[PDB]
Amino acid sequence: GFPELKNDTFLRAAWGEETDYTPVWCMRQAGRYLPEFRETRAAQDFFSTCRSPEACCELTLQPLRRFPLDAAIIFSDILVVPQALGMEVTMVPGKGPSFPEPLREEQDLERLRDPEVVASELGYVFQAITLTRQRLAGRVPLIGFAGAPWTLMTYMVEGGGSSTMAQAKRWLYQRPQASHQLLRILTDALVPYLVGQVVAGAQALQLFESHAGHLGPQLFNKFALPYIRDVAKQVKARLREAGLAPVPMIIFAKDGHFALEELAQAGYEVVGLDWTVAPKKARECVGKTVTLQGNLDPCALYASEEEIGQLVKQMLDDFGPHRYIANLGHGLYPDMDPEHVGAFVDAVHKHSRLLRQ
Amino acid sequence: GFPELKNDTFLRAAWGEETDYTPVWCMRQAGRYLPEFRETRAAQDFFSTCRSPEACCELTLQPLRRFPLDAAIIFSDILVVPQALGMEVTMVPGKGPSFPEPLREEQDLERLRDPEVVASELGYVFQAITLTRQRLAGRVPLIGFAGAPWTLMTYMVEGGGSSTMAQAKRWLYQRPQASHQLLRILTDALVPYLVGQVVAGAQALQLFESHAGHLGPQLFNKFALPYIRDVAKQVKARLREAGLAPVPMIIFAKDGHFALEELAQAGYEVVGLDWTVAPKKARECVGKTVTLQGNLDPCALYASEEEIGQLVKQMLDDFGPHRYIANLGHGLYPDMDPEHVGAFVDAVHKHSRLLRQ
């Protein structure tokens, strides 16, 4: 019941197919760097914005009116999941996200909802997705998303961001069983949520393991990787059983250089990269099968439009014209210039075509 | 004029020689995890502690009374250099280091001292070094240290820590010339400071590029690597001209997985590693010449003493018995248990001997 997709370059690249140019989108393309985003967000408090389908739809569409991006990503927040699990969150503008009552001991898991009921608590996200898919009218694909189990665990235990994740890693080392219990609750809530996002209209899904870097290989393979593999396996299985077509799935492990090899075998069509991994080395690590996404340093956007063009040209030369979706190595920062974001988008389109003809 | 060194295992490993066991030390071994450190530090404000030779000497010796560490590192702070350069710093316990008036525009470089006069401003550090070298009475080598140019630049421009280094990276992209000017001022101040540390008694030097990870390969090679190479070249040159023996130099680029290959050719005897780089991959990157230092996840110390022993055994199996100095992948955290630090030290000694016999 949705408009037929007109530009599917993003999906074709995600599946590994040859395309006429490299598709490009930007993490946080709906963000504070756009004045219109700030104005729309000023209408209510953060989570009240996430709960209004029209407001999410509007924020999602704003970057598309400025730039010819090849995908839209639904406006929402990864913290909606721990909130639907029963945790109270606050988004204080100066600080960032906060859980005044973080999980600290094993007994604290008792206050969480059964993960099976989370998707019903997240109906507002499904509404925003259906609405935006209708309003996009098939212009480009709509990407749905959620935080990965370990990363969500970090927010729940730390109560917000952290430079070391010492409290959450302390849980991995001192409370391994409780840790697995929590990661499994998170996985069991994420699967039906992600499946519901596709049922509502999402055409691709991205799992954000933004806090992967704090773990080295060993802890990552024990506590992050199994759940990352499970999410993809179970989402595809449920979509099949429901009669729907699976969608391409992207795993983004920020600062996860050490896990690229396992990630390329984790059941995701696309492996997203941060800007610290040289494209050619990433290609060696992942192989010739998966599609890579990324990975320009977001701060490169502070350089002139002309320099941005050169940096993009070099990035595309390293990735090559196959199995690649362009994006930054992390989300856009609040003080970046919309014109520089436009320069980024245009350079990818221009240089990827030159690189094929 | 100093006591002859009794245990030189650390220096022999640093130079790449075979030793009977693997020497081990810990970044922040003089730190808040020790109750005696907190008590000694409570006597005065942070920088007043750094300025008292006896207080620095005492803090340096405290961990050695608890554990048979193979090296001592002088108690000081990397921020003493920008302070001697003319910047006002404050060490507020709740927050951390702070420069209320950070460098933000190019003209702000005019308030800094000529780097040639910095070493005279840092005479108190030379005094603490001479004093501790005397009091150690040759028990183990004394390591001197400083922050690397890029990392010091980050504190000067950001005014403290940051999860993105967006202001400092904005300087790299928008003010490249001013950036090089500042990095060169920092290099020109670090060289005579590090040379003075050895003249005062330091037997090894470690340069802490703690904020390397925010840069990817390209920016790192343009702005961090040249100055890192220059520091080692010029320090060795000045020591030679002065009639002194150069000392082994360690370059520690935290989150610098992408630069290991260049770092191994940067003129340092030892390349320190964070815990995210698997030891075997680090060995492939650096080659068979340089000594590696590291790299246990500091949070591993939250595990039981018995688990710490196994994790250490595995770490040593990966590094192998040659060209290796054991250490954590970053400094000890304030809430770690001194007994677990002892367990770490003992496991390295025990397992490295088993691995040779």
SS in 3 state form for chain B? CCCCCCCCHHHHHHCCCCCCCCCECCCCCCCCCCHHHHHHHHCCCHHHHHCCHHHHHHHHHHHHHHCCCCCEECCCCCCHHHHHCCCCCEEECCCEEECCCCCCCHHHHHHCCCHHHHHHHCHHHHHHHHHHHHHHCCCCCEEEEEECHHHHHHHHHHCCCCCCCHHHHHHHHHCHHHHHHHHHHHHHHHHHHHHHHHHCCCCEEEEEECCHHHCCHHHHHHHHHHHHHHHHHHHHHHHHHCCCCCCCEEEEECCCHHHHHHHCCCCCCEEECCCCCCHHHHHHHHCCCCEEEEEECHHHHHCCHHHHHHHHHHHHHHHCCCCEEEEECCCCCCCCCHHHHHHHHHHHHHHHHHCCC
Q: Tell me phi and psi for residue B334, to 5 degrees.
A: -55, -25
Residues of A in contact with B281 (CB under 8 A): 258
Q: Tell me phi and psi for residue A91, to 5 degrees.
A: -115, 75
Return the HEC string of B181-221.
HHHHHHHHHHHHHHHHHHHCCCCEEEEEECCHHHCCHHHHH
Q: What is the DSSP letter of A332?
A: P
Return the HEC string of A243-312.
CCCCCCEEEEECCCHHHHHHHCCCCCCEEECCCCCCHHHHHHHHCCCCEEEEEECHHHHHCCHHHHHHHH
- In a mutational test of the A interface, the residue from B210, B299, B306, B332 whose CB has the highest number of chain A CBs within 10 Å is B299
Q: Residue B299: which of B344, B265, B268 has the closest Cα? A: B344
- Continuous H helices in chain A: 9-14, 35-42, 46-50, 53-66, 80-84, 118-121, 123-136, 149-158, 166-174, 176-199, 217-219, 225-241, 260-263, 279-286, 305-319, 338-354
Q: How far apart are CA B348 and CA B337, in angstroms?
A: 17
Active site residue B155: yes
Residue owning tokens 């992948």: B329
Gaps after residue numbers in chain A (C–N over 2.5 angstroms)? none
Q: Tell me phi and psi for residue A355, to 5 degrees.
A: -70, -5
Helix (H, G, I), strand (E, B) or coil at A145: strand
Element (H, E) at A144: strand A142-147
| Region at B129 (left for phi over 0; alpha for psi -120 to 50; beta for the rest) | alpha
Is residue B46 a contact partner of residue B89, using CB atoms and an 8 Å limit? no
Q: How far apart are CA A23 and CA A327, in angstroms?
A: 9
Residues 6+ apart with CB under 8 A from B230: B187, B191
Way it was determined: X-ray
Q: Residue A114: which of A86, A73, A77 has the closest Cα? A: A86
Helix (H, G, I), strand (E, B) or coil at A199: helix
| Region at A320 (left for phi over 0; alpha for psi -120 to 50; beta for the rest) | left
Q: How far apart are CA B85 and CA B138, in angstroms?
A: 33
Is residue B301 a contact partner of residue B342, using CB atoms and an 8 Å limit? no
For chain B, give the number of residues.
357
Show the tokens assigned to B231: 């520091």
Residues 6+ apart with CB under 8 A from A117: none
Q: Verify whether the Cβ–Cβ distance A329 to B275 is below 8 Å.
A: no
Q: How far apart are CA B36 and CA B43, in angstroms?
A: 11
Q: How far is CA A337 from CA A159, A328, B214, B219, in A?
A: 31, 14, 20, 20
Residues 6+ apart with CB under 8 A from A197: A74, A125, A126, A129, A144, A145, A146, A205
Q: How far apart are CA B298 and CA B313, in angstroms?
A: 15
Q: Verify whether the Cβ–Cβ distance B299 to A166 is below 8 Å.
A: yes
Q: What is the resolution of this structure in A?
A: 1.8
The most distant pair of C-alpha atoms in chain B lies apart, rounded to whole Å, by 61
Radius of gyration over every alpha carbon of chain A, rounded to an integer in angstroms:
19
Q: Residue B51: which of B92, B90, B88, B80 has the closest Cα? A: B80
Is residue B4 a contact partner of residue B134, using CB atoms and an 8 Å limit? no
| The dihedral sign for the CA sequence B128, B129, B135, B141 | positive
Q: How far apart are CA A303 and CA A311, in angstroms?
A: 9
Q: How far apart are CA B166 and CA B102, in angstroms?
A: 14
Active site residue B28: yes
The count of other CB atoms within 10 Å of the CB of residue B59 is 25
Residues 6+ apart with CB under 8 A from B342: B66, B67
Q: Does residue B174 sit at the A interface (CB-CB below 8 Å)?
A: yes
Q: Residue B291: which of B10, B5, B7 has the closest Cα? A: B10
Q: How far apart are CA B323 and CA B336, in angstroms?
A: 28
- Cα B297 to chain centroid, rounded: 16
Considering B155, B193, B227, B268, which one is annotated as catalytic?
B155
Q: How far apart are CA A319 and CA A340, in angstroms?
A: 22
* Cβ burial, residue A305 (10 Å; 0-12/13-18/19+): middle
B295: preceding bond cis by omega (within 30 degrees):
yes
Q: What is the DSSP letter of A163?
A: S
Q: Does residue B237 sit at the A interface (CB-CB below 8 Å)?
A: no
How far does the CA of residue A246 sit from the closest CA of chain B (Å)?
A: 33
Q: Residue A289: which of A275, A272, A270, A274 has the closest Cα? A: A270
Q: How far apart are CA B132 and CA B142, in angstroms?
A: 8
Element (H, E) at A205: strand A204-209
Q: How far apart are CA A337 and CA A353, in angstroms?
A: 25
Q: Does residue A213 sit at the B interface (CB-CB below 8 Å)?
A: yes
Q: Tell me phi and psi for residue A249, to 5 degrees.
A: -120, 135
Q: What is the DSSP letter of A356?
A: T
Q: How far is CA B301 from CA A145, B215, B306, B344, in A?
A: 35, 29, 11, 8
Architecture of domain A1-357 in this structure: Alpha-Beta Barrel (3.20)
* Cβ burial, residue B288 (10 Å; 0-12/13-18/19+): exposed
Q: What is the C-alpha end-to-end distance of chain B, expressed in Å? A: 38
